[PDB]
């Protein structure tokens, strides 16, 4: 029964209570039992029609369904909503997961699982805490739900409530005998999450409970995780608790100001200079047994000057925001290390401003440190490498030449990132294997974008020899796509997507220049795809022989010189001339 | 119809062909609703009328839309006209001749290497068949253009 | 300096953009912010170029003031000119009381203060209720400012 199940679902999804009465009654009980039990394709999920009605809070509709035939309240089904796609829990959890108190107060008296788990062991208390709906949160603890339901990431519902600015939901769990000391899988507490967004009122409740205050699993004290944020009220609040030692309380304001100008959503140098100067005034306030910054030389990538020392020294560099942004970023470079993600974030923002301010020379130099920092952190740079080639394409339009050592350093680290990205597919098995399949593949595209713009731009001979090494590195890696393509086949195919930025103007796939650079380093010209077509077969399948024949004429002679088999066949036994569909390429194939 | 085809308003062009308006309403100047589309490389506009049976016909001067598309150095819609209706191999070879002619002799498009490769494609296809061979008509050398006698062989080109 | 502050305040009050754009042209951020920090009393009421731009209704002026210029929502201005003229006004509060939904949603997307309390601790939510503009209240509720912020007389929105 397909349509009848959907009509039963339609009776509860749209809230038409008369259809629900006419469906459960006026017919048999066994057939409707299968209909109201679950849905198959309705909503892209497999939940009971009462459950999807609880998602919309149809409290009156779900009340009538229980009167005729009591559906099992503990029955579960998929609910794809906020918090990623979820094989959702019971309807009481789903009503709590929908933030609808009208359905929660009915199932509890009717009989429901108070502490029912989800795929990520989510209790209905956490589901209400995820929505931050206080009256539902007040009700589950009145139903005596467990206050210590920690996630698979060791995130208790109180810590889940601490993600947002729920100053009332967080304080209510504190009233319900729950101290905020349940650390996450990364050791994160409710203190750190409230300090991420500067929730001074939430921390004050946790201050009021007087339970404990400690660092997370990253070794970051709650003032430090607020220091990398842009809200000094938390560090000010912890100053009342006297947990701010004078070394940490000064570098906090040093970090607090810098993030308040080194953010896309937070860019104000006036408080940034004020916080840095007041901290350095406090840094110089110690007088005897003075404490100072661990001095860091300027990065070959980021900037050309080291950090300031005198409190008034940073006042003179306030006029040029480039100097003070760097000065505020060195002090968080030394205290957070090269592996911190939150100190790598200002690196991308700075060059993006220079991209907006046409300082493409400073944009490329400084952005190399973000790739340098993320190499230390051993994380993906697929957004970083794409942003390099986008800005590389932008300055070609402005005709600002790149630095050949700069374009080599990004290329040298990209293949190391791709080697990590290829190993990332090896490192993961079932968590995000399709994401990892799409992770290394898009990284190869960025390298293809980076190499293509490198060929277009001027490059020194000593760097160009090292530039071809990364291409020589990847052609030895031989990355095989989902369809069996390789790096050579990626440039050969004209169906290769190009980034929406000016990289369309610098990538001309099928790109002869990239392919010519690919052929000298050992391209697999006779390699076959999933359909068995060689590099000669893919290039002849192009349907535009007139638009870019210069790319075609270069690749007809040269790829044949690499060893392309004119008599090669596909998995469907297709020859290059047989699968041509282009007279110009086939005649070129006949000549070659 | 041709006014939107004169511009890049491809949404108006693809809509108006469905409004029971023929693509063959030809102006006396010679525009067959694709001649006015053959100036800015309107690959999206021409694809609509090629689908809509554009009915290729020469202008008032006698130049084909394939030639007029080659007049604006727009190789994108040249292939559309070549792939539409009759192949007409005699014009197919000269389409490469005409398009390559301007790439070394146009201010907006000064590409010397593209002139050879288009002519080489013309020279390849002119003698590709072997028998029933066609050759360029031997116009007399013109003193303005030196004393050259065209390219009847791929070796001299 | 003060005369230039009056000039930029009148330009923001009127609604022209290039006038104060040229008035701030070739200037550092110090005097630019000072001109934008003209919180001086006009008509007996404290007002600011950002505030009077939000009070105006021109979403373009405030979209330039938040993006290309450095001004902050923490500001002092009128909240109700007829009989109240109470200070401590957020630009979002001024826009909500005036009723310009485009300026309200633009300031919300910018990140303006949604839970501000004046000396009479009045929220922009109750100003939107006072104006009766449904979409402003809907946007504010979707952005989850509050619902139970009352006046000093415990006067709910």
């Amino acid at each position: 029964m397909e349509g009848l199940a959907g009509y039963v679902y339609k009776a509860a999804s749209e809230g038409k209570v008369l259809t629900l009465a006419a469906l459960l009654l006026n017919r048999s009980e066994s057939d409707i039992r299968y209909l109201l039990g679950y849905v198959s394709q309705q909503g892209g999920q497999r939940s009971t029609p009462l459950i999807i009605a609880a998602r919309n809070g149809h409290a009156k509709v779900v009340r009538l369904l229980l009167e005729h035939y009591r559906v099992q309240t503990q029955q579960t089904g998929t609910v794809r909503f906020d918090g990623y796609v979820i094989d959702g829990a019971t309807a009481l959890w789903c009503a709590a997961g929908a933030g609808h108190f009208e359905v929660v107060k009915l199932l509890v008296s009717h009989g429901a699982n108070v502490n029912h788990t989800t795929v990520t062991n989510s209790t209905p208390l956490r589901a209400a805490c995820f929505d931050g709906r206080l009256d539902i949160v007040k009700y589950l603890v009145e139903n005596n739900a467990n206050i210590s339901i920690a996630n698979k990431y060791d995130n208790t519902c109180l810590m889940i409530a601490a993600y947002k600015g729920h100053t009332d939901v967080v304080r209510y769990l504190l009233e319900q005998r729950a101290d905020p000391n349940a650390k996450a899988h990364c050791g994160a507490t409710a203190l750190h999450f409230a300090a991420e967004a500067g929730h001074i009122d939430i921390v004050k409740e946790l201050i009021k409970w007087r339970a404990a205050i400690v660092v997370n699993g990253h070794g970051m004290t709650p003032l430090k995780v607020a220091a990398e944020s842009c809200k000094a009220d938390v560090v000010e609040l912890l100053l009342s608790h006297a947990d701010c030692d004078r070394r940490s309380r000064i570098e906090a304001l040093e970090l607090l100001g810098a993030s308040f100008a080194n953010d896309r959503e937070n860019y104000d140098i006036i408080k940034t200079y004020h916080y840095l100067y007041l901290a350095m005034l406090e840094r110089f306030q110690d007088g005897d047994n003075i404490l100072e910054k661990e001095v860091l030389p300027p990065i070959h990538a980021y900037g050309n000057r080291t950090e300031c020392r005198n409190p008034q020294e940073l006042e003179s560099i306030r006029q040029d925001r480039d100097a003070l942004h760097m000065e505020g970023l060195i002090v968080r470079e030394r205290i957070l290390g090269a592996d911190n993600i939150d100190v790598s974030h200002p690196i991308i923002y700075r060059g993006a401003v220079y991209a907006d301010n046409m300082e493409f020379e400073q944009c490329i130099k400084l952005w190399l440190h973000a790739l340098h920092l993320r190499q230390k952190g051993n994380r993906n740079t697929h957004k970083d490498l794409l942003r390099f080639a986008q800005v590389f394409s932008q300055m070609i339009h402005l005709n600002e030449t790149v630095k050949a050592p700069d374009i080599e350093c990004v290329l040298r680290c990209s293949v190391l990132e791709i080697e990590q990205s290829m190993n990332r597919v090896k490192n993961i098995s079932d968590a995000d294997v399709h994401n990892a399949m799409d992770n290394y593949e898009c990284n190869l595209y960025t390298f293809l974008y980076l190499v293509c713009i490198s060929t277009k731009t001027q490059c020194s001979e000593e760097d160009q020899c090292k530039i071809n090494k990364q291409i020589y590195n990847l052609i030895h890696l031989d990355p095989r796509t989902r369809e069996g393509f390789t790096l050579l086949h990626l440039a050969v195919n004209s169906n290769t997507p190009v980034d929406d930025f000016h990289t369309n103007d610098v990538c001309s796939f099928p790109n002869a220049l990239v392919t010519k650079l690919l052929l000298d380093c050992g391209a697999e010209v006779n390699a076959v795809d999933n359909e068995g077509n060689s590099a000669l077969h893919i290039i002849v399948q192009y349907n535009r022989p007139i638009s870019d024949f210069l790319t075609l004429h270069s690749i007809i002679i040269s790829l044949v010189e690499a060893g392309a088999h004119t008599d090669m066949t596909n998995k469907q036994n297709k020859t290059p001339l047989d699968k041509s569909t282009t007279g110009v390429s086939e005649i070129l194939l006949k000549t070659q | 119809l041709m006014i939107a085809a004169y511009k890049g308003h491809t949404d108006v062009v693809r809509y108006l062909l469905e409004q029971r308006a023929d693509p063959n309403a030809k102006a006396h100047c010679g525009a067959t609703a694709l001649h006015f589309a053959a100036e800015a490389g309107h690959i999206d506009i021409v694809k609509e009328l090629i689908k809509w049976r554009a009915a290729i016909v020469v202008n008032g001067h006698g130049m084909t839309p394939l030639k007029v598309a080659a007049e604006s150095c727009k190789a994108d819609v040249v292939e559309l006209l070549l792939s539409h209706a009759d192949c007409d191999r005699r014009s197919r070879i000269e389409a490469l001749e005409l398009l390559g002619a301007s790439f070394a002799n146009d201010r907006e498009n000064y590409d010397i290497i593209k002139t050879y490769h288009y002519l080489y494609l013309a020279m390849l296809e002119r003698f590709q068949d072997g028998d029933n061979i066609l050759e360029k008509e031997v116009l007399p050398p013109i003193h303005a253009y030196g004393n050259r006698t065209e390219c009847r062989n791929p070796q001299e080109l | 300096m003060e005369g230039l502050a009056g000039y930029v305040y009148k330009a923001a009050s009127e609604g022209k953009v290039l006038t104060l754009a040229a008035l701030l042209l070739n200037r550092s951020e110090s005097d630019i912010r000072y001109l934008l920090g003209y919180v001086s009393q006009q008509g007996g009421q404290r007002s600011t170029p950002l505030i009077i731009a939000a009070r105006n209704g021109h979403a373009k002026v405030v979209r330039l003031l938040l993006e290309h210029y450095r001004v902050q929502t923490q500001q002092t201005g009128t909240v109700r000119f007829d009989g109240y003229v109470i200070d401590g006004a957020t630009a979002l509060w001024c826009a909500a009381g005036a009723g310009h939904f485009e300026v309200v949603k633009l300031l919300v997307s910018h990140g303006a203060n949604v839970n501000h309390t004046t000396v009479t601790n009045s929220t922009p939510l109750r100003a939107a209720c006072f104006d009766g503009r449904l979409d402003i209240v809907k946007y504010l509720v979707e952005n989850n400012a509050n619902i139970s912020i009352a006046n000093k007389y415990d006067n709910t929105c």
């Binding site: 809230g15 038409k16 259809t19 009465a21 006419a22 009654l25 006026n26 009538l64 | - | -």
Partner: protein, 60 residues
Amino acid sequence: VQKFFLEEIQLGEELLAQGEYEKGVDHLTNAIAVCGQPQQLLQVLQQTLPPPVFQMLLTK
């Protein structure tokens, strides 16, 4: 028709569920008996409305 009666027992009181109970309860009065289970549909329709409106639907 019995199928139309089922449609009447399913869409006759569409205004009643939408708020306009004047034209819905009156229309569902005949539609409750027109269904194959008149007593069951009338009790369910009374249960579909409030207990204060259960008597109004039943006496309609």
